[PDB]
Design a protein around this motif. Structure first.
Motif, PDB file in Angstrom:
ATOM      1  N   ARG A 269       2.809   1.034  -3.781  1.00  0.00           N
ATOM      2  CA  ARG A 269       1.778   1.287  -4.799  1.00  0.00           C
ATOM      3  C   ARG A 269       0.850   2.495  -4.511  1.00  0.00           C
ATOM      4  N   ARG A 270       1.077   3.191  -3.382  1.00  0.00           N
ATOM      5  CA  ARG A 270       0.461   4.514  -3.096  1.00  0.00           C
ATOM      6  C   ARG A 270      -1.074   4.507  -2.972  1.00  0.00           C
ATOM      7  N   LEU A 271      -1.609   3.410  -2.420  1.00  0.00           N
ATOM      8  CA  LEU A 271      -3.048   3.270  -2.220  1.00  0.00           C
ATOM      9  C   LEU A 271      -3.666   4.432  -1.417  1.00  0.00           C
ATOM     10  N   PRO A 272      -3.082   4.781  -0.242  1.00  0.00           N
ATOM     11  CA  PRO A 272      -3.687   5.895   0.516  1.00  0.00           C
ATOM     12  C   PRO A 272      -3.876   7.176  -0.292  1.00  0.00           C
TER      13      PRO A 272
ATOM     14  N   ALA B   7      -4.147   7.265  -3.435  1.00  0.00           N
ATOM     15  CA  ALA B   7      -5.085   6.925  -4.515  1.00  0.00           C
ATOM     16  C   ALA B   7      -6.524   6.974  -3.967  1.00  0.00           C
ATOM     17  N   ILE B   8      -6.740   6.354  -2.799  1.00  0.00           N
ATOM     18  CA  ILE B   8      -8.053   6.361  -2.109  1.00  0.00           C
ATOM     19  C   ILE B   8      -8.604   7.777  -1.942  1.00  0.00           C
TER      20      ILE B   8
ATOM     21  N   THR C  49       0.827  -1.192   0.000  1.00  0.00           N
ATOM     22  CA  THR C  49       0.000   0.000   0.000  1.00  0.00           C
ATOM     23  C   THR C  49       0.856   1.234   0.000  1.00  0.00           C
TER      24      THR C  49
ATOM     25  N   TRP D 197      -9.803  12.503  -9.086  1.00  0.00           N
ATOM     26  CA  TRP D 197      -9.902  11.529 -10.167  1.00  0.00           C
ATOM     27  C   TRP D 197     -10.783  12.053 -11.287  1.00  0.00           C
TER      28      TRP D 197
ATOM     29  N   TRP E 257       0.154   9.126 -13.630  1.00  0.00           N
ATOM     30  CA  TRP E 257      -0.409   9.527 -12.349  1.00  0.00           C
ATOM     31  C   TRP E 257      -0.425   8.383 -11.374  1.00  0.00           C
ATOM     32  N   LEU E 258      -0.051   8.688 -10.129  1.00  0.00           N
ATOM     33  CA  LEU E 258      -0.002   7.729  -9.026  1.00  0.00           C
ATOM     34  C   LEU E 258       0.881   6.492  -9.267  1.00  0.00           C
ATOM     35  N   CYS E 259       1.952   6.679 -10.049  1.00  0.00           N
ATOM     36  CA  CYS E 259       2.932   5.612 -10.211  1.00  0.00           C
ATOM     37  C   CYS E 259       3.839   5.519  -9.015  1.00  0.00           C
ATOM     38  N   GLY E 260       4.041   4.289  -8.574  1.00  0.00           N
ATOM     39  CA  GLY E 260       4.988   3.967  -7.538  1.00  0.00           C
ATOM     40  C   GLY E 260       6.063   3.034  -8.078  1.00  0.00           C
TER      41      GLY E 260
ATOM     42  N   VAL F   4      -9.837   9.639  -5.131  1.00  0.00           N
ATOM     43  CA  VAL F   4     -11.208   9.231  -5.388  1.00  0.00           C
ATOM     44  C   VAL F   4     -12.178  10.061  -4.557  1.00  0.00           C
ATOM     45  N   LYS F   5     -11.925  10.115  -3.248  1.00  0.00           N
ATOM     46  CA  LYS F   5     -12.824  10.794  -2.306  1.00  0.00           C
ATOM     47  C   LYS F   5     -12.913  12.296  -2.516  1.00  0.00           C
ATOM     48  N   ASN F   6     -11.829  12.913  -2.987  1.00  0.00           N
ATOM     49  CA  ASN F   6     -11.717  14.373  -2.987  1.00  0.00           C
ATOM     50  C   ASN F   6     -11.903  15.019  -4.344  1.00  0.00           C
TER      51      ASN F   6
END
Lengths: 321, 321
Positions: free
Chosen positions: A119-122, A124-125, A116, A133, A140-143, A128-130
């Motif tokens: 791969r930068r899940l937090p 990424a999550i 997490t 996206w 974008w959001l590459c780890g 989505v919420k804000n």
């Protein structure tokens, strides 16, 4: 009847096993909240057995409050840095702890934290919420991932070994480990190479810390350590907070000496909500959930219970320290 | 000079390749934001080559706007459900796609999403930030893990296999899969068992959807599917939004038909921020970052660039559909 103090509300199976022991009077702290020092001193007075947790600092003071009746401390953890072992051994007190039963879950949590984070899940999550996206985006959001990576493990014990084992099929090219002594037989499964801490930091794309907290490991992960890490590398700690120098970590994360970090442990616990490390989008902090599956927690509880009971009765314990 | 339209800013290596093609005139949508339909029609007019993304709906209208010059469409994706394939093959247009290069990253992402979801990392992260964390707590944030679990995989192609292979050393006892046709050779590495969809849902502790979106798979994961799932089971989707009935999933999650879900894809994309699914603490949604590592995105870009150029020049393509 022998007195038993339990320092917290524990999983049912363990509590029932205690409730079933006709030779025991079981006093319990009836809460999910940690028991203050003062109430623990009051509670252990006259106890033949103490069932305790990671959270509880069992030092000379508690032992004194106990005092003479105490023959067995049973901790619901594999870690023991919360016990004053030298005072305990002097007093002839037996110790139960819970190795092995949490190995798979902890290693599992350690890999979850690794993935997490890298791969930068937090982030990424939250995107989505804000409303961040807007589409699929190529940049974008590459780890950084594990294919052909080098993984460095600090402490190649049962838990480290089980981390290595889960990591191998993600395409890890080489495993390195450090400690106080080579372990060829345990390392052989992964072709792990024993190296110095400096070399480990230099060569790894991922660092996982899975050792005991000891004088030799306190403040081990400091400024010199992060300096030697690759700026593309990810740092994972599942041991104890005191293994890391938290200010050095912040600084390393803030200036980009490393890519990201994920911590399952901190100093202190809990971490203050205003702490610098929590202002950082490339630091992931978990509240010490390594062993947190239903099955594992239940097993640990039953084991603590059984260690205590055998201790009280002068029998061999299922797992004694 | 042959005209080429690129529908977004792509990774450097791919754009450098195009920028070095002296036989090409390369027009680009100069943005990270998805190109509107009207702007896309405008841009493809007279194009010999179109380099496009998953986000871009290349239907009859686009091809018409193109129209007669278009010989080659290159997509920076393995999925192709965004292309009007029958219209394309009727018009004799060649198609490049990006299989294989993203297999390991995607599988890697799906395992991260499975672990973050079942081990409750997002809840855990927010409990640290919002003051919920007060101590180590035995009964708190417990999830379900993979030890002696049954994992069910829908679509056992390259990515599904690569999910299976990563999951094996977490202690999975049994792999099942479903699809249109058994795959003995590809399943044998995992001793996976071909099963019907109802049996898959009934037997699995974890369900991972890694299939193409087709008529046979649209709305596949619906109310009857979720009803048949274990209420302790975790559902993961990395395929396409339209494989799932989102309302049924929401209801399943809200009533406790299943324990949690983790989605890398939704309908539509992006998901609106006030969506029911995002009010649920046991639903994790990522913004379609399956293949998001620097290495992989860069590889995809170069591939799509090279497929395009070989197409333009009537040569064998590195990876043709």
């Amino acid at each position: 009847l022998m007195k038993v103090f339990v320092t917290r509300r524990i999983p049912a199976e363990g509590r029932v096993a205690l409730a079933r022991a006709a030779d025991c009077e079981v006093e319990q702290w009836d809460s999910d909240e940690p028991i203050p020092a003062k109430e623990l001193e009051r509670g252990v007075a006259g106890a033949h057995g103490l069932l305790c947790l990671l959270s509880d600092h069992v030092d000379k003071r508690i032992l004194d409050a106990a005092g003479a009746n105490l023959k067995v401390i049973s901790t619901m953890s594999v870690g023991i840095d919360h016990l004053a072992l030298d005072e305990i051994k002097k007093r002839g007190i037996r110790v139960g702890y819970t190795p092995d039963v949490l190995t798979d879950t902890t290693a599992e949590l350690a890999v979850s934290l690794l993935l997490t984070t890298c791969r930068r899940l937090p982030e990424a999550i939250e995107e989505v919420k804000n409303g961040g996206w807007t589409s699929w985006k190529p940049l974008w959001l590459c780890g950084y991932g594990l294919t052909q990576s080098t993984v460095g493990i600090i402490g190649l014990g049962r838990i480290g070994q089980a981390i290595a084992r889960r990591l191998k099929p993600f395409g890890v090219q080489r495993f390195l480990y450090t400690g106080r002594q080579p372990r060829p037989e345990e390392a052989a499964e992964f072709q792990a190479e024993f190296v110095s801490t400096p070399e480990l930091a230099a060569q790894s794309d991922f660092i996982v810390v899975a050792c005991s907290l000891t004088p030799a490991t306190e403040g081990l992960c400091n400024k010199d350590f992060f300096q030697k890490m690759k700026e593309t590398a990810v740092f994972i700690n599942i041991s104890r907070g005191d293994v890391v120098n938290q200010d050095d970590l912040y600084q390393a994360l803030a200036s980009g000496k490393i890519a990201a970090a994920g911590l399952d442990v901190t100093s202190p616990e809990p971490l203050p909500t205003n702490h610098p490390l929590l202002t950082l989008k490339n630091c992931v902090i978990l509240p010490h959930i390594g062993s947190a599956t239903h099955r594992t927690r239940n097993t640990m509880s039953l084991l603590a219970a059984n260690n205590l009971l055998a201790g009280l009765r002068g029998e061999p314990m299922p797992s004694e320290l």
